[PDB]
Design a protein around this ligand. Structure first.
Ligand SMILES: COc1cc(C(=O)Nc2ccc(NC(=O)c3ccccn3)cc2)cc(-c2c[nH]c(=O)[nH]c2=O)c1
Ligand SMILES: COc1cc(C(=O)Nc2ccc(NC(=O)c3ccccn3)cc2)cc(-c2c[nH]c(=O)[nH]c2=O)c1
Ligand SMILES: COc1cc(C(=O)Nc2ccc(NC(=O)c3ccccn3)cc2)cc(-c2c[nH]c(=O)[nH]c2=O)c1
Ligand SMILES: [Mg+2]
Ligand SMILES: [Mg+2]
Lengths: 450, 450, 450
């Protein structure tokens, strides 16, 4: 049968001490709630009902593009009251999974096992074993089925030793949710309508409640502060790195590796310590990444070596190219195959042709460089004052001498040669040699003040 | 009643294999003994008696500014002999706390609980539970009070299983210290006068010895080598990062964060992995720090973003400024609000006015730059040979073309425009345009040697 | 008696998902098998028989210089079949130790204890205790001697609780290996000739099998995938850092330190977080290394400070020199005593004389710089097009003004002074002052387009 998801995300998150609502704080560069919405989407949810309240405006701006049904809960009357806000949109013959925006590491595989175990007209309750279950609702099984969730304050000596506890995550059909939520009361110390009470209501109706144990505790762990958030981040990062290592990526130290998006990789990829991968990154075969690199939204061809402390963003690098150390690729940098980018070099919105080298103390911006060019140390592409970034065009096999200024708009045709310390403001012809005529004063017997 | 502290710091620290005495090795950029002196100061100690011996000269130069009473112990005759060196300066009606220069993580909160529990004319002994208490003096309690500290070699089978052990940290009044220290003998295998013996002496006098358990084992842990020192450092760093995370600082990875001084922060501050904070650092609201940054004695206004691999020292940064990646702020760098400092840029002892940009491959030293200036790539402020760093003055709304040399002493007035590749040695007037007249040799049909 | 070693290294290593055979994947910059060959060499092995099969060509190219006897096993018929391939080369009266190319952390000290315990005409079997010994061959001792290795599938309830397990590492004389290997059968579920069977064969001959327990489990741990390889790497790195810390090296964080070769050090050396040491590195006394540095095949004299994010390779640095932050030393960089190399500076195959400073945005390549020179910001050594890296010679006490281009081949004699923004193509005489005569157009009342 069909499936829809409900995500609780109305929490203030007071203990984060932030202007952001609780669920917008990120895990691996992504808001906590976005992990949940994506997991719900990978399950095949027709609808994803997002229960929101605190920081409504911020939720809407940060999650504007999410395919969710925005359900405002004006008052936090309890988790059952929150689910009931979305209940008029539940299809009677569809399954509904209840998730929490601040417990983001819940897996598609655990939820699939939970949905699968759900008995007809009953509930599938997600449970977990804790070494210290103190404070949590103990799961009581009788004839294999969950008969009660016994709270810490109510449990007897024997029940206190039960390690299996309630996570709040559950699956039931829409009609059963509509029916039971209308029957939840708030007669307890907190005066709240608890979704927990649906287990007692199911048993009252002689409907079966089946327990499904989660793989890891960290999957159901919520973050109430930035310390807990950091623990979720380390667990998530270690999980991503282990999957990569088992896929054949040589990550020198999985404890000093960060993936904040997606990684597509070839075989024999080597990633040194303190590397950060952001957005959508694709590495070809035998790519080597040196210590301290940051790759954001990049495409790296086969056999590329990125030497230490290189920062690349919205760039493309061709096969056998050599980058770094200390290279900066800014958005629009397109390096063809067998290119060379060295230390203290900045490339921005420029194309660099096959075999070309830009190895030292250079700025290349809004330029087109052909194949087999030699861009000398200290070369800078610049503009006139009041200009609107006008473009530098360099053809094939051009030599640009050290410390030359290329003043855009300007073209340098194939095979041209530019001498060191030149100011290029006018177009250079095919095979034109341009050298600066220097005037110098020479004074003999100049005794230095030493 | 009043309080004074005694700190034992006469140890050679042979196993550190250093020319430094034991207590001068640092934890979080601060000598071990300095943590103890600061803790003693935060308690409200009138006097802090520093027992020193080994590396006396080095102790005096490294701790010249400390408000302590320098007490030389010429021979290490034991911990009781060391305390007795300071005993003539103990006030009879003041409390005395005994601390160790090589056990630096002892907290003010633990010591406050220790002082509070001290019975009149008695001792408050600091204790700790160990999973493996092997080698340590077992605490024997009878009617709630400490009757003996039983050494490993003397303990019976039942006593060997006692997990509560002696830390050496204790509080008593000055008159009781004077009285008991004069009664300590050295009749034992080591021939030393042990401060431990004061517990047996207190009981002999029918004075009460009360045990106070420490929060963590690491608080009372001593460092005898650099491996143990490193373990204290990791524990201390993790403790600082957790406090920050609970205060609302987003530290991406607390295991890759280092605070070596003090941090003052606003709300919604984000600190990426491998960031080092040194000296006195103040961050405004929503400051973002990219991976690999080093901030030493800096003030950062609200909404500043520091991009990866930026190194800042003795600098001030105004609100909404953008720094890095690969920026270097040296002492005296003052960036006004909404400024821009980019890759491979070095700023030293210079002021940079509101909205001004210095985005590439530039050195700015001993300069004053006004508001809304554009400092082109490759611009360098320099001096003549034999000069004494003479100062560059740039007014408001100045354009400085790429690869220009500003030869100090020199002034460039408001609205001036300097063309690329210029050598400025003479003052530039308000709205003066200065461009280089270039001479070039152009040779057609120059076939490159390829 | 004499000793020879046999190393099993014929494995495909399918779960690494690599084009490399299993044993060539590195630990601390060295192939797994190379650690084993080096350990075997430090024991005093006359011969090291390398059993190889999978990726034969790659094994031979990567280990071309190893003093081993290359033994091809065309089919993996079992570990006993592999050892038997080398058995015709075993001396009857020499000891033979059996090692595994994919279990690289085995120590010389453990193997020495194993050889020592070997009874005449018997076997010394290396064993280890596991908390969970599930799947491993349980060691059965009777009268102190190993009577059987009981496999998981065969063990009774009582035997399943035995924590002591077989590692596969063993020592026996050559004649006993020849005799027993010829008697190993393949009658088991896998149809393989197991070296394990030699224990049962030894007992059949009334020869004694003595168990020797390894120091750590990690010493005998094999790597079947890159995740396991990463765990071996972390254990190895932590082991190297602890030895260094106990030797007196101040490593700020041993969890963020990497040694991939050898380190020779003086006293009071300080190494900050995220430092990588590669090849053969020698540090003098009181060397300080800032965060993020990479030192490969370097020699660093006493009292040198390397400031953050500096990358050095095949270089020599004299005493009291100051390097970084953001410095790049490329192969052949030789810095004399009391030199200064600053941010965004690249030195390649050049000598830099005593007291000389190269502090900003500079490239120095194929140069000889004398003593007490001042190399201004933006200075670049370059060549003509079609040149073959021709060399720049700078004498003593030379001032080179900011943004000067030194066009090789060229000499600048003692005491010469070069003004800022100069192009040097011709030799400069002793005490010659060379300054650029500039031509400039000055336009008054130039209103900027703002
Ligand atoms: C952040 O938005 C919300 C979150 C939650 C919530 O209860 N989240 C949550 C649930 C369970 C766990 N689980 C664990 O941490 C756990 C469980 C078992 C073992 C170990 N750990 C964590 C977070 C409830 C409401 C919400 C409440 N009340 C209302 O009225 N409206 C709402 O939206 C809102
Ligand atoms: C470094 O200067 C000194 C230090 C100490 C000293 O004993 N320090 C110390 C004391 C206790 C601990 N505690 C633990 O490590 C511990 C305790 C319980 C559980 C776990 N860990 C550590 C260091 C004693 C003298 C000194 C000695 N003798 C003299 O004659 N003069 C002196 O100054 C000098
Ligand atoms: C990689 O090359 C090989 C390796 C091995 C091999 O068996 N290696 C190995 C042996 C023991 C362990 N030990 C553990 O992991 C361990 C043990 C006890 C406790 C904990 N861990 C690890 C690796 C065998 C052959 C090889 C096999 N068969 C053939 O026919 N030819 C060969 O070369 C080849
Ligand atoms: Mg320049
Ligand atoms: Mg120039």
């Amino acid at each position: 049968k069909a499936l829809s998801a409900v995500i609780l995300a109305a929490g203030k998150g007071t203990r984060m001490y932030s202007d952001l609502p609780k669920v917008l704080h990120t895990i691996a560069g992504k808001p906590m709630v976005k992990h949940v919405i994506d997991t719900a989407h990978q399950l095949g949810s027709e609808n994803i009902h997002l229960i929101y309240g605190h920081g409504g405006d911020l939720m809407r701006t940060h999650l504007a593009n999410e395919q969710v049904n925005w359900v405002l809960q004006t008052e936090q009357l309890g988790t059952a009251h929150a689910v009931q806000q979305a209940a008029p949109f539940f299809k009677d013959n569809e399954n509904i999974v209840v998730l929490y925006g601040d417990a983001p590491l819940i897996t598609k595989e655990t939820l699939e096992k939970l949905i699968e175990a759900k008995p007809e007209n009953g509930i599938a309750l997600l449970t977990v074993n804790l070494d210290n279950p103190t404070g949590y609702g103990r799961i009581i099984r009788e004839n294999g089925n969950v008969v009660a969730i016994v709270e810490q304050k109510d449990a007897n000596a024997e029940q206190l030793n039960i390690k299996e506890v309630n996570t709040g995550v559950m699956v039931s059909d829409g009609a059963s949710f509509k029916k039971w939520l209308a029957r939840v009361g708030n007669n307890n110390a907190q005066g709240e309508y608890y979704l927990t009470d649906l287990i007692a209501l199911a048993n009252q109706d002689n409907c079966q409640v089946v327990a499904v144990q989660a793989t890891d505790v960290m999957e159901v762990e919520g973050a109430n502060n930035r310390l807990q958030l950091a623990a979720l981040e380390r667990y998530f990062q270690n999980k991503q790195a282990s999957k990569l290592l088992l896929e054949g990526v040589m990550i020198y130290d999985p404890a000093r590796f960060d993936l904040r998006g997606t990684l597509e990789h070839g075989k024999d990829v080597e990633i040194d310590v303190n590397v950060i991968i952001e957005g959508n990154v694709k590495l070809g075969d035998r790519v080597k990444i040196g210590t301290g690199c940051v790759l954001k939204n990049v495409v790296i061809g086969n056999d590329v070596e990125i030497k230490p402390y290189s920062v690349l963003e919205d760039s493309i690098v061709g096969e056998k190219a050599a980058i770094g150390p200390f290279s900066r690729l800014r958005p629009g940098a397109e390096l063809a195959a067998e290119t060379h980018v060295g230390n203290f070099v900045e490339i921005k919105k420029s194309t660099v042709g096959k075999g070309s080298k830009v190895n030292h103390l250079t700025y290349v911006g809004d330029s087109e460089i052909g194949s087999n060019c030699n861009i000398g140390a200290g070369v800078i592409t610049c503009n006139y004052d009041g200009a609107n970034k006008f473009k530098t065009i360099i053809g094939d096999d051009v030599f640009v001498g050290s410390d030359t200024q290329l003043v855009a708009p300007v073209k340098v045709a194939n095979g041209a040669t530019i001498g060191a310390g030149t100011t290029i403001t006018r177009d250079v012809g095919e095979n034109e040699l341009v050298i600066t005529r220097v005037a110098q004063r020479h004074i003999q017997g100049w005794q230095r003040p030493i």
